[PDB]
Design an enzyme around this catalytic site. Structure first.
Site, PDB file in Angstrom:
ATOM      1  N   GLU A 170     -11.943  -3.323  41.040  1.00  0.00           N
ATOM      2  CA  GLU A 170     -10.960  -2.827  42.331  1.00  0.00           C
ATOM      3  C   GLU A 170     -10.209  -1.318  42.288  1.00  0.00           C
ATOM      4  O   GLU A 170     -10.481  -0.040  42.060  1.00  0.00           O
ATOM      5  CB  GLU A 170     -10.043  -3.664  43.222  1.00  0.00           C
ATOM      6  CG  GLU A 170     -10.329  -3.705  44.103  1.00  0.00           C
ATOM      7  CD  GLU A 170      -8.476  -2.508  44.397  1.00  0.00           C
ATOM      8  OE1 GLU A 170      -7.926  -1.957  43.439  1.00  0.00           O
ATOM      9  OE2 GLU A 170      -9.276  -1.785  44.942  1.00  0.00           O
ATOM     10  N   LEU A 211       0.574  -6.496  40.853  1.00  0.00           N
ATOM     11  CA  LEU A 211      -1.010  -6.858  41.406  1.00  0.00           C
ATOM     12  C   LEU A 211      -0.604  -8.213  41.770  1.00  0.00           C
ATOM     13  O   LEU A 211      -1.295  -8.612  40.381  1.00  0.00           O
ATOM     14  CB  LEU A 211      -1.978  -6.256  41.473  1.00  0.00           C
ATOM     15  CG  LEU A 211      -2.455  -4.255  41.208  1.00  0.00           C
ATOM     16  CD1 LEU A 211      -3.373  -3.680  41.197  1.00  0.00           C
ATOM     17  CD2 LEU A 211      -1.514  -3.623  42.803  1.00  0.00           C
TER      18      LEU A 211
HETATM   19  N1  LIG Z   1      -2.046  -4.091  46.748  1.00  0.00           N
HETATM   20  C1  LIG Z   1      -1.944  -2.341  46.171  1.00  0.00           C
HETATM   21  O1  LIG Z   1      -3.103  -1.750  45.921  1.00  0.00           O
HETATM   22  C2  LIG Z   1      -0.203  -1.830  45.226  1.00  0.00           C
HETATM   23  C3  LIG Z   1       0.111  -2.172  45.581  1.00  0.00           C
HETATM   24  N2  LIG Z   1       1.696  -1.902  45.058  1.00  0.00           N
HETATM   25  C4  LIG Z   1       2.464  -2.918  44.998  1.00  0.00           C
HETATM   26  O2  LIG Z   1       3.776  -2.957  45.762  1.00  0.00           O
HETATM   27  C5  LIG Z   1       5.396  -3.254  44.936  1.00  0.00           C
HETATM   28  C6  LIG Z   1       6.633  -2.803  45.125  1.00  0.00           C
HETATM   29  O3  LIG Z   1       6.959  -2.334  45.844  1.00  0.00           O
HETATM   30  P1  LIG Z   1       7.700  -1.208  46.480  1.00  0.00           P
HETATM   31  O4  LIG Z   1       8.704  -2.206  45.793  1.00  0.00           O
HETATM   32  O5  LIG Z   1       7.850  -0.330  47.861  1.00  0.00           O
HETATM   33  O6  LIG Z   1       7.214   0.042  45.898  1.00  0.00           O
HETATM   34  P2  LIG Z   1       8.066   1.543  45.235  1.00  0.00           P
HETATM   35  O7  LIG Z   1       6.530   2.140  44.315  1.00  0.00           O
HETATM   36  O8  LIG Z   1       8.232   2.154  46.886  1.00  0.00           O
HETATM   37  O9  LIG Z   1       9.670   0.804  45.014  1.00  0.00           O
HETATM   38  C7  LIG Z   1      10.493   2.235  45.932  1.00  0.00           C
HETATM   39  C8  LIG Z   1      10.982   2.884  44.497  1.00  0.00           C
HETATM   40  O10 LIG Z   1      10.884   4.635  45.109  1.00  0.00           O
HETATM   41  C9  LIG Z   1      11.343   5.134  45.699  1.00  0.00           C
HETATM   42  N3  LIG Z   1      11.192   6.095  47.280  1.00  0.00           N
HETATM   43  C10 LIG Z   1       9.940   5.105  48.089  1.00  0.00           C
HETATM   44  N4  LIG Z   1       9.528   5.541  48.483  1.00  0.00           N
HETATM   45  C11 LIG Z   1      10.330   6.240  48.335  1.00  0.00           C
HETATM   46  C12 LIG Z   1      11.719   7.815  50.133  1.00  0.00           C
HETATM   47  N5  LIG Z   1      10.307   7.606  51.292  1.00  0.00           N
HETATM   48  N6  LIG Z   1      12.383   8.654  49.647  1.00  0.00           N
HETATM   49  C13 LIG Z   1      12.983   8.568  48.303  1.00  0.00           C
HETATM   50  N7  LIG Z   1      12.429   7.689  47.377  1.00  0.00           N
HETATM   51  C14 LIG Z   1      11.272   6.917  47.678  1.00  0.00           C
HETATM   52  C15 LIG Z   1      12.330   5.120  45.375  1.00  0.00           C
HETATM   53  O11 LIG Z   1      13.239   5.357  44.537  1.00  0.00           O
HETATM   54  P3  LIG Z   1      14.619   4.981  43.394  1.00  0.00           P
HETATM   55  O12 LIG Z   1      15.000   3.164  43.476  1.00  0.00           O
HETATM   56  O13 LIG Z   1      13.964   5.102  41.679  1.00  0.00           O
HETATM   57  O14 LIG Z   1      15.575   6.071  44.277  1.00  0.00           O
HETATM   58  C16 LIG Z   1      12.982   2.724  45.274  1.00  0.00           C
HETATM   59  O15 LIG Z   1      13.420   2.722  45.210  1.00  0.00           O
HETATM   60  C17 LIG Z   1       4.406  -4.303  43.974  1.00  0.00           C
HETATM   61  O16 LIG Z   1       3.810  -5.259  43.795  1.00  0.00           O
HETATM   62  C18 LIG Z   1       3.511  -3.435  43.634  1.00  0.00           C
HETATM   63  O17 LIG Z   1       2.768  -3.679  42.861  1.00  0.00           O
HETATM   64  C19 LIG Z   1       1.856  -1.135  44.639  1.00  0.00           C
HETATM   65  C20 LIG Z   1       0.779   0.113  44.237  1.00  0.00           C
HETATM   66  C21 LIG Z   1      -0.309  -0.238  45.140  1.00  0.00           C
HETATM   67  C1  LIG Z   2       1.149  -1.699  39.366  1.00  0.00           C
HETATM   68  O1  LIG Z   2      -0.027  -2.180  40.385  1.00  0.00           O
HETATM   69  C2  LIG Z   2      -1.252  -1.028  40.600  1.00  0.00           C
HETATM   70  C3  LIG Z   2      -1.613  -0.830  41.607  1.00  0.00           C
HETATM   71  C4  LIG Z   2      -2.226   0.032  41.279  1.00  0.00           C
HETATM   72  C5  LIG Z   2      -2.733   1.421  43.014  1.00  0.00           C
HETATM   73  C6  LIG Z   2      -3.728   0.837  43.555  1.00  0.00           C
HETATM   74  C7  LIG Z   2      -4.764  -0.115  43.162  1.00  0.00           C
HETATM   75  N1  LIG Z   2      -5.880  -0.583  44.271  1.00  0.00           N
HETATM   76  C8  LIG Z   2      -6.400   0.072  45.372  1.00  0.00           C
HETATM   77  N2  LIG Z   2      -6.578  -0.260  46.296  1.00  0.00           N
HETATM   78  N3  LIG Z   2      -5.083   1.905  45.864  1.00  0.00           N
HETATM   79  C9  LIG Z   2      -3.871   1.625  44.398  1.00  0.00           C
HETATM   80  N4  LIG Z   2      -2.851   2.803  45.523  1.00  0.00           N
HETATM   81  C10 LIG Z   2      -3.141   0.986  40.279  1.00  0.00           C
HETATM   82  C11 LIG Z   2      -3.123   0.152  39.080  1.00  0.00           C
HETATM   83  C12 LIG Z   2      -3.608   0.576  37.963  1.00  0.00           C
HETATM   84  C13 LIG Z   2      -4.568   0.530  37.071  1.00  0.00           C
HETATM   85  C14 LIG Z   2      -4.453   1.915  35.601  1.00  0.00           C
HETATM   86  C15 LIG Z   2      -5.578   2.297  35.301  1.00  0.00           C
HETATM   87  C16 LIG Z   2      -5.760   2.970  35.993  1.00  0.00           C
HETATM   88  C17 LIG Z   2      -6.533   4.712  36.948  1.00  0.00           C
HETATM   89  O2  LIG Z   2      -6.552   4.566  37.548  1.00  0.00           O
HETATM   90  O3  LIG Z   2      -6.868   5.501  35.523  1.00  0.00           O
HETATM   91  C18 LIG Z   2      -2.390  -0.901  38.777  1.00  0.00           C
HETATM   92  O4  LIG Z   2      -1.707  -1.514  37.464  1.00  0.00           O
HETATM   93  C19 LIG Z   2      -2.300  -3.187  37.096  1.00  0.00           C
END
Ligand SMILES: NC(=O)C1=CN([C@@H]2O[C@H](COP(=O)(O)OP(=O)(O)OC[C@H]3O[C@@H](n4cnc5c(N)ncnc54)[C@H](OP(=O)(O)O)[C@@H]3O)[C@@H](O)[C@H]2O)C=CC1
Ligand SMILES: *COc1cc(Cc2cnc(N)nc2N)cc(C#CCCCC(=O)O)c1OC
Length: 206
Positions: A32, A25
């Site tokens: 958050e 993140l």
């Molecule tokens: N702002 C926010 O709330 C959030 C931000 N993020 C961020 O998102 C970024 C990473 O993004 P991204 O790379 O897309 O991450 P994902 O976690 O979606 O990584 C994708 C991996 O997961 C699997 N996967 C995802 N969708 C599928 C599907 N439909 N079928 C099969 N396998 C699937 C595959 O696994 P494999 O390669 O093992 O097959 C693929 O390589 C980071 O910066 C992270 O922090 C993440 C969560 C919340």
């Molecule tokens: C690796 O980054 C990441 C992603 C999430 C997922 C997240 C955060 N905020 C919002 N609004 N939506 C999503 N899907 C969460 C974390 C975290 C954490 C830690 C502990 C928490 C708990 O739920 O018990 C995160 O890590 C930096």
């Protein structure tokens, strides 16, 4: 039985739909995260006796979570991945697709199971989010809007808050958000680390 429950997506994104940087993140918002935990963990008291929520996440997002907070406690975790070598774990389910994940959960936790599923959340990965956005059971987005064009390398796949999607995605009233979340949620802009952000809930008719 594989698509009775609806899916809810939860994400934190900038006004430019930015969600991540170097596999993490691009912001440090402790509050958050507190919201995220509260929302994905909350279960109605009456059902709290034997019901837990599910958190579906992509493999990258799973590795991005600090071991200390992995796996997400008080919630059933399921990592979506196609690569299976020696990924250790403590009973953490593993599915190769969003639907494969649902069949695994409904089979593992049936009407006979001790633990029952309450809500299913899609919590991460732009890739997994992309698949969720296309899933016919996804009808809700818990979005945390960050009013800052923070540099990101990964973005949310669909501009659900833009005019082009305004007839499909609608923003609910704060009272309905709290009602659905089951708890009181901060209304308005929150300031943390010189950034303004607020919580919103968007829905679409299935
Ligand atoms: N702002 C926010 O709330 C959030 C931000 N993020 C961020 O998102 C970024 C990473 O993004 P991204 O790379 O897309 O991450 P994902 O976690 O979606 O990584 C994708 C991996 O997961 C699997 N996967 C995802 N969708 C599928 C599907 N439909 N079928 C099969 N396998 C699937 C595959 O696994 P494999 O390669 O093992 O097959 C693929 O390589 C980071 O910066 C992270 O922090 C993440 C969560 C919340
Ligand atoms: C690796 O980054 C990441 C992603 C999430 C997922 C997240 C955060 N905020 C919002 N609004 N939506 C999503 N899907 C969460 C974390 C975290 C954490 C830690 C502990 C928490 C708990 O739920 O018990 C995160 O890590 C930096």
């Amino acid at each position: 039985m594989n698509q009775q429950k609806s899916l809810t997506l939860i994400v934190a994104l900038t006004t430019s739909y930015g969600i991540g940087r170097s596999n993490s993140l691009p912001w440090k918002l402790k509050k958050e995260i507190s919201y995220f935990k509260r929302v994905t963990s909350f279960v109605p008291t009456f059902d709290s006796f034997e019901s837990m929520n599910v958190v579906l996440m992509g493999r990258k997002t799973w590795e991005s979570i600090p071991l200390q907070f992995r796996p997400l406690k008080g919630r059933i975790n399921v990592v979506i991945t196609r690569n299976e070598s020696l990924d250790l774990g403590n009973g953490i389910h593993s599915a190769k697709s969003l639907d494969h994940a649902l069949e695994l959960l409904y089979r593992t936790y049936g009407s006979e199971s001790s633990v029952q599923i309450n809500r299913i959340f899609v919590i991460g990965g732009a890739q997994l989010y992309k698949a969720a956005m296309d899933h016919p059971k996804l009808d809700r987005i818990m979005a945390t809007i960050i009013y800052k064009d923070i540099h990101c390398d990964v973005f949310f796949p669909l501009k659900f808050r833009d005019k082009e999607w305004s007839s499909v995605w609608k923003k609910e009233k704060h009272s309905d958000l709290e009602s659905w979340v089951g708890t009181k949620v901060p209304h308005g802009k929150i300031n943390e680390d010189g950034f303004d952000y607020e919580f919103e809930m968007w829905t679409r008719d299935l």
